[PDB]
């Protein structure tokens, strides 16, 4: 029923501004309070402010003035939030939230990930990782696919076009001077490799890239 849809990700340079929105349905928008919450990696949830469209009431967190300016469009339909300053401090996940009066929240939005960086959009690389020269110890062989130097997130990594998914560990990317680095491991038996073909497939929507790299034995 109650759904609070908001766009995926926004990527804006330091200094400039962002206008976040929240498409609300499943309930009467003009009846219940709309709150905004900021979540950072390892610092916890931080409440920003809240608007009541009734009765126009706009509350703010004293630490968030005047970085955030909250407005509401009522037609159409959404709740707006403009971030004015934009610094490396602002890089976080911003959540839409419905609530009945102050000050708790019932339903949360999908969340928009905001990345404040001076870096430019760049294409990935993709590298094949092969085991040691000779043989692998045991019966289970381990293969990898290293993706180094790409901006921004995300990257969809699939093995064998989607035919291989069991025993696959995809590791989250880390920021390394403007460009991300991601790795993924796969564990299969020695009877399948290198008897059958194994290929890691990486696609980046922001750069329109499609790389299929075959792991050849050393």
């Amino acid at each position: 029923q109650v759904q609070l849809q908001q766009p995926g990700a926004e990527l804006v340079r330091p200094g400039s501004s962002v206008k976040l929105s929240c498409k609300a349905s499943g309930y009467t928008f003009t009846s219940k309070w709309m709150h905004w919450v900021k979540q950072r990696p390892i610092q916890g949830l931080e409440w920003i402010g809240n608007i009541d469209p009734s009765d126009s009431e706009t509350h703010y967190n004293q630490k968030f003035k005047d970085k955030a300016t909250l407005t509401v469009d009522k037609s159409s339909s959404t709740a707006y939030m403009q971030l004015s300053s934009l610094t490396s401090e602002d890089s976080a996940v911003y959540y839409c939230a419905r609530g009945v009066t102050r000050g708790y929240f019932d339903v949360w939005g999908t969340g928009t990930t905001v990345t404040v960086s001076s870096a430019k959009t760049t294409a990935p690389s993709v590298y094949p990782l092969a085991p040691v020269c000779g043989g692998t110890t045991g019966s289970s062989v381990t293969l990898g696919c290293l993706v180094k130097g790409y901006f921004p997130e995300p990257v969809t990594l699939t093995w064998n076009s989607g035919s291989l998914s069991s025993g696959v560990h995809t590791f989250p990317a880390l920021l390394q001077s403007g460009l991300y680095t991601l790795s993924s491991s796969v564990t299969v038996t020695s009877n399948t490799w290198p008897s059958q073909t194994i290929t890691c497939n990486v696609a980046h929507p922001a750069s329109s890239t499609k790389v299929d790299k075959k792991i050849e034995p050393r």
């Binding site: 949830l45 409440w47 509350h59 959540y95 708790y104 939005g109 040691v132 290293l146 880390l174 790795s183």
Partner: protein
């Protein structure tokens, strides 16, 4: 303006046993609110006004407390409960959250599996050389990595990324990657990644040679 401290920070509980999580406030508080957030999903309201449950909340969650000390109790721990839990307050505007009690699922001690990979020829073409060491399937999360080049330890240029707890076997996995230049890589021969886990004092050692 009240500071809320949730204790403990990381919870470890086995399925089918009582779970008590606590939040502590700086000063007197009238009503408390709790929030559940599963990995890769939006948070949701569990408990409102200290004790009342939200709609859609399974019958196993409970809340109580007063003033400064408040508690969320799970009568019987289930697999779909492994999530981060957050404190929430008002009557003091803000309107602040707690640190976040991370409820992790308990598993019988697991030993890490190590696979070391030499830098690819495609990267060595560019001038860079990244040695990747995969640490797969281990319990618990806490582990130590030690990169040794020809015996000597290296600390700068090391990248370490952990995964969230698996839904099937409930084990952790991390990726250790040391980045070096083509000049720095070819000056030395032996490259070793050591895994120091709680399961065994003896480090799990996987290494290779450059000239071979």
């Amino acid at each position: 303006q009240i500071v809320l401290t949730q204790s403990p920070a990381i919870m470890s509980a086995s399925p089918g046993e009582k779970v008590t999580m606590t939040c502590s406030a700086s000063s007197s508080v009238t009503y408390m609110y709790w929030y559940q957030q599963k990995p890769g999903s939006s948070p949701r309201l569990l408990i409102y006004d200290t004790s009342n449950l939200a709609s859609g909340v399974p019958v196993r969650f409970s809340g109580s407390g007063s003033g400064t000390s408040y508690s969320l109790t799970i009568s019987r721990m289930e697999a779909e409960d492994a999530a981060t839990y957050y404190c929430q307050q008002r009557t003091n505007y803000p309107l602040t959250f707690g640190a976040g009690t991370k409820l992790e699922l308990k598993r019988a001690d697991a030993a890490p599996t190590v696979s070391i990979f030499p830098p690819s020829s495609e990267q060595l073409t560019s001038g860079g050389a990244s040695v990747v060491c995969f640490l797969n399937n281990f319990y618990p999360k806490d582990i130590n990595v030690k990169w040794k080049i020809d015996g000597s330890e290296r600390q700068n240029g090391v990248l370490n990324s952990w995964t969230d707890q698996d839904s099937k076997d409930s084990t952790y996995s991390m990726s250790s990657t040391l980045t070096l230049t083509k000049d720095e890589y070819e000056r030395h021969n032996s490259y070793t990644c050591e895994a120091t886990h709680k399961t065994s004092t003896s480090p799990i050692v996987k290494s290779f040679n450059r000239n071979e």
